[PDB]
Design a protein around this ligand. Structure first.
Ligand SMILES: [Mg+2]
Ligand SMILES: [Zn+2]
Lengths: 130, 353, 133, 38
RNA sequence: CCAGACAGCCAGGAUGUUGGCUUAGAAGCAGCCAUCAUUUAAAGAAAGCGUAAUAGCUCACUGGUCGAGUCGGCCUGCGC
């Protein structure tokens, strides 16, 4: 629509990063709304409605909102990516459920980059606080 | 609760009568069969026979579940009434009254759909009484039959008015045409088409020899006299030719194939206008001939059935009333001739004759 | 080949209504009927839908689910039809407490964690039905 | 091809085209829409 | 509209739900009425095709790729 709602969307993105800087990734190269339905039903079972999949990863939407916080996502941006903001607990299991979704057929698109919250590599981190 | 007991008994009796007239088990048999060939899937590989199967399936299943739920309603209302008599639960008794009324109204809708199945049944009717070839005895019988039918119409609530009444010089009326107006009048009175057989000790005869006279009641609905639509320019063929200027106009209706010529006037427009009025006149004439031909075909069929027109027999000598078609009998001749034919017309209408 | 095609659990062997619609495939009519009847666990007389994933070995997998909210609104109202001109004349009325009771009974399989949101979805279904809360 | 004096798009896949000074519309969706200004 | 626009190109287009009735069947798509909620990137109780109805094929819509203009209304001259 308009640059006005774009501004509230950008402010919302920055605010969601600030309130929960925990993050994970997913990509819909071949995935079904029933798959997103299972993910967001379990998400609403875990916690509130605030679960946002913010797939606005253009090189000047997400990268333009990036220099506030977690500046490493500028190179992450310009490809098909859907971020996900998280409060609960340091390094929660939502990266792990995105991994099991990668097992159950998102056809290896997100490539589990991990959003470097502990500034880690592209590989898995099974060491999470449980 | 005594009207409730009598009312449940009346519903049980009329449900049994309805089952006997409807032949429930036979229709259930065709219902089960239609269900079976519906289950084999070739029936939807043929379109139109599946259309017919859907129609007959819906009708049979609706009648079957209606009669079944009335059986269940009769038994459970009877049981809960037995509860309500002794336990005296007033709210549950009121529930019994409500569900009993619902069951009665729904079976009433079923028998309603059966008895008023005609397309013209809702409209008002012209009902005619005509005496036979007998004489003054048949005249008197036609007149008092007209009295009885007026009494029945007033008892039902139908509004009556005598359109025409040709009387006899001695007594009685020879013929009479009556407009019976009101809802469902033709449906209520459509079983009366036919012949009544009077047997009584005739008073007009000098010796008191009994007479066997006849009368007919013929009922037909007030059909709408539809407007006669004008003809189309494409449906007409317009030619002009020299009269014997080419002012002569030959108008030809092509889909039927009828021509009219006009050549007497110098004005081609006048010739065409007279030809167009001739077109309209012949079209009206042909529509009337088609209607009369269809009426004659229906008369051929009902003259073929012939003797079946003798529907009712009043033996006033032995005091018995008989419907031959349903075969029903009674002895209260004075009540019958007063106009208490409700039992007979209901029997005939559930028979479907 | 997963399309739900089912009738109320009370009437076993749906030979008139569905029939060939459940039986285009090589899976047997009797197998479908016994799978549907295997119904006896909770209640009968009410439609219970099921997802039918049919494989090549004709050993289909079936996942049953909760009865429809439409006929549940019918059982809550106690009425039969409530759709014919509801705006011109209101036909019925359902309590919001009854709707929330319906929602908390339907919270098992209905896709949603917010019970009030599922509730207000249900009176959305109820206004579409015609009955006004 | 239908020859009309008022040719226009009827459905969403219909395309105006001008060939030899004649306005046609062509339809990749339904050949019934194929029509010509004349 | 360089908070990347239009057209292409890769993806989704769901949940209650098949919203009910009347039909014979009514599932977005025969008619009538209401036209919500959830997940929210977005999905209309559906714009079209289609089914005997389902099924199935698109669309609106929104995500990804690309990187300079886009789109259709008004007035008006000359033309077809
Ligand atoms: Mg010109
Ligand atoms: Zn076209």
């Amino acid at each position: 629509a308009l640059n006005l709602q774009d501004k509230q969307a950008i402010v919302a993105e920055v605010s969601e990063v600030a309130k929960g800087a925990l993050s994970a990734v997913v990509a819909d190269s071949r995935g079904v709304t029933v798959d997103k339905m299972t993910e967001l039903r379990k998400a609403g079972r875990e916690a509130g409605v605030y679960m946002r999949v913010v797939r606005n990863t253009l090189l000047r939407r997400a990268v333009e909102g990036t220099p506030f916080e977690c500046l490493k996502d500028a190179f992450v941006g310009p490809t098909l990516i859907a971020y996900s903001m998280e409060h609960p607990g340091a390094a929660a299991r939502l990266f792990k459920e995105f991994a099991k979704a990668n097992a159950k057929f998102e056809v290896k698109a997100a490539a589990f980059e991990g959003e470097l919250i502990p500034a880690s590599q592209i590989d898995r981190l099974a060491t999470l606080p449980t | 609760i005594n009207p409730v007991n009598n009312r449940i008994q009346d519903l049980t009796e009329r449900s049994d009568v309805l089952r006997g007239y409807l032949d429930y088990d036979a229709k259930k048999e065709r219902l089960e069969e239609v269900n079976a060939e519906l289950e084999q899937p070739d029936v939807w590989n043929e379109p139109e026979r599946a259309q017919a199967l859907g129609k007959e399936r819906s009708s049979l299943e609706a009648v079957v579940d209606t009669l079944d739920q009335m059986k269940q309603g009769l038994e459970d209302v009877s049981g809960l009434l037995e509860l309500a008599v002794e336990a005296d639960d007033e709210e549950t008794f009121n529930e019994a009254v409500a569900e009993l009324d619902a069951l009665e109204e729904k079976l009433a809708q079923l028998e309603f759909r059966r008895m008023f199945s005609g397309e013209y049944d809702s409209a008002d009717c012209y009902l005619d009484i005509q005496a036979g070839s007998g004489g003054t005895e048949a005249q008197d019988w036609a007149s008092m039959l007209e009295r009885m039918y007026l009494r029945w119409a007033e008892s039902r609530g139908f509004k009556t008015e005598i359109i025409e009444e040709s009387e006899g010089e001695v007594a009685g009326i020879k013929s009479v045409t009556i407009k019976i107006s009101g809802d469902y009048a033709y449906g209520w009175l459509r079983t009366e088409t036919g012949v009544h057989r009077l047997v009584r000790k005739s008073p007009f005869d000098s010796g008191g020899r009994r007479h066997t006279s006849f009368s007919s009641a013929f009922v037909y609905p007030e059909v709408d006299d539809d407007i006669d639509i004008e003809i189309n320019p494409a449906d007409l063929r317009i030619d002009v030719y020299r009269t014997s200027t080419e002012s002569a106009v030959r108008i030809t209706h092509i889909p039927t194939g009828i021509v009219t010529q006009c050549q007497n006037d110098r004005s081609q427009h006048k010739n065409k206008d007279q030809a167009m009025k001739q077109m309209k006149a012949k079209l009206y004439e042909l529509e009337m001939q088609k209607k009369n031909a269809e009426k004659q075909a229906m008369e051929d069929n009902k003259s073929d059935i012939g003797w079946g027109s003798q529907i009712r027999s009043y033996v006033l000598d032995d005091s018995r009333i008989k419907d031959l078609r349903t075969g029903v009998e009674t002895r209260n001749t004075q009540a019958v001739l007063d106009g208490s034919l409700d039992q007979f017309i209901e029997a005939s209408l559930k028979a479907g004759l | 080949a997963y399309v739900k095609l089912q009738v109320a659990a009370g009437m076993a062997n749906p030979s008139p209504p569905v029939g060939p619609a459940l039986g285009q495939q090589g899976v047997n009519i009797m197998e479908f009927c016994k799978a549907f009847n295997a119904t006896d666990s909770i209640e009968k007389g009410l439609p219970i839908p099921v997802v039918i994933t049919v494989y090549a070995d004709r050993s289909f997998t079936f996942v049953t689910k909760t009865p429809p909210a439409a006929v549940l609104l019918k059982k809550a109202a106690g009425i039969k039809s409530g759709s014919g001109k509801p705006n011109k004349d209101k036909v019925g009325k359902i309590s919001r407490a009854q709707l929330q009771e319906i929602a908390q009974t339907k919270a098992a399989d209905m896709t949603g964690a917010d019970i009030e949101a599922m509730t207000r979805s249900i009176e959305g279904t109820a206004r579409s039905m015609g009955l006004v809360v | 091809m239908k020859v009309r004096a008022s040719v226009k798009k009827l459905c969403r896949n219909c395309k105006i085209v001008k060939r030899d000074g004649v306005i046609r519309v062509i339809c990749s969706a339904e050949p019934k829409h194929k029509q010509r200004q004349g």
